Amino acid sequence: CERVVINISGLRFETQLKTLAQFPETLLGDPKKRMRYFDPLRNEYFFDRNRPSFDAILYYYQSGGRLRRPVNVPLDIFSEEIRFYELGEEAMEMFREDEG
């Protein structure tokens, strides 16, 4: 199944396109929303953002919804990322409660 490449400040992530289609409203799951960050030269989406956080942001989709904050990533930072990637208020709170 057609795969996608996400470059987060040089750290390259790869996943299948359906994995991201599992959450059509999020930024990465919405073609129109992620289109702005596509690099035609390298065939990958680039984000000038926090590297440590994306590990979880991607696992969220692969896990079907699990949103855990990496032990080495501050709470205020990881929260900003969840917001940017547009994961959704639901999953957003669910994270909040699973976190305090």
Binding site: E2, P31, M35, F38, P40, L41, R42, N43
Partner: protein, 326 residues
């Protein structure tokens, strides 16, 4: 407004209108007429000519080549394109295999009496050939200087994206254009799918059959006119389409459109053709013509382009009732 425009995001500049050679060159019309048709198109600014190894079993390519060699036009001023896929009765003379793309284009180039073409197209997708093989072959013929660029035709978005993808994967050359069907009764692909590929990977659209093979001209209102394409031997498929329940539904819609046509003071053809260029998503529309009159009429579509207000468009959308949902 802008007569010439970049084919996709490539640096290749093409007229918004081009002249094709399907059915006519080396077939329906005569070489004298072919010559006349091309000269007209040329002197009127059109620099785009499309053909294909399959047209008239190579003959179209011969005629087009002869005209070019006769009028002695400067090669740097023409943008010739040819399509490859069906080049023979043998098993290995069809497809997008490295063997066929090379042999195929070589054969065409010979017929055209040209050292290269500006753009070579895969005439349709090939389920029996790995994408890598195909992109590698396209990239090969371009490095051999047998083509300037390559493009796809009748490929799905995913297929075009796969090609682009493979090219980046192996550092080969991506396709720059998709030659897709587009007219008031075939809008889905060009209007919904291609604009995405245009923005994402810069692939432009070079559309064909603006008059749905003559149908949008309205001349099939009362039936199959003698000497019309649907009447030609070997085009029962077209005749059948025209005389079908669906065929009739269209013709009926033409009558209404015809109104808007007279209203803006231009023929229905000019309306349809100009309708095709209304959106910058389309780089060029390939015209078809059996008469010098048909051609000159069609070229007029350009003047019609300014009159196409958003209202005029919405009106046409209504009568058509086939505007695709993005």
């Amino acid at each position: 407004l802008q007569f010439y425009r970049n084919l996709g995001k490539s640096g290749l500049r093409v007229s918004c209108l081009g002249l094709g050679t399907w059915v006519t060159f080396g077939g329906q019309i005569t070489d004298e007429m072919a010559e006349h048709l091309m000269t007209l198109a040329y002197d009127n600014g059109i620099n785009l000519f499309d053909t294909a190894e399959v047209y008239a079993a190579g003959k179209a390519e011969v005629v087009l080549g002869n005209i070019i060699k006769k009028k002695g036009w400067r090669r740097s001023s023409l943008v010739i394109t040819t399509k490859i896929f069906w080049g023979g009765k043998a098993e290995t003379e069809r497809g997008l295999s490295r063997k066929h793309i090379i042999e195929g284009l070589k054969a065409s180039l010979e017929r055209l009496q040209l050292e290269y073409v500006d753009v070579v197209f895969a005439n349709r997708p090939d389920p029996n050939t790995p994408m890598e093989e195909t992109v590698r072959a396209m990239t090969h013929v371009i490095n051999q200087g047998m083509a300037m660029y390559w493009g796809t035709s009748r490929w799905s978005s995913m297929e075009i994206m796969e090609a682009y993808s493979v090219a980046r994967q192996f550092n080969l050359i991506p396709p720059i254009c998709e030659q897709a069907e587009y007219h008031m009764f075939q809008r889905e692909k060009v209007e919904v799918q291609l604009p995405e590929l245009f923005h994402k990977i810069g692939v432009g659209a070079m559309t064909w059959s603006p008059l749905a093979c003559g149908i949008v001209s309205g001349k099939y209102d009362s039936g199959i006119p003698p000497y019309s394409r649907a009447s030609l031997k070997g085009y029962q498929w077209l005749k059948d389409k025209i005389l079908s329940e669906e065929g009739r539904r269209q013709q009926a819609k033409l009558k209404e459109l015809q109104a808007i046509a007279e209203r803006l003071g231009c023929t229905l053809p000019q309306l349809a053709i100009a309708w095709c260029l209304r959106n910058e998503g389309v780089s060029s529309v390939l015209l078809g013509a059996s008469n010098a009159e048909q051609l000159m009429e069609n070229i007029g579509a350009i003047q019609v382009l300014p009159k196409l207000s958003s209202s005029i468009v919405h009106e046409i959308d209504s009568i058509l009732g086939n505007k695709p949902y993005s």
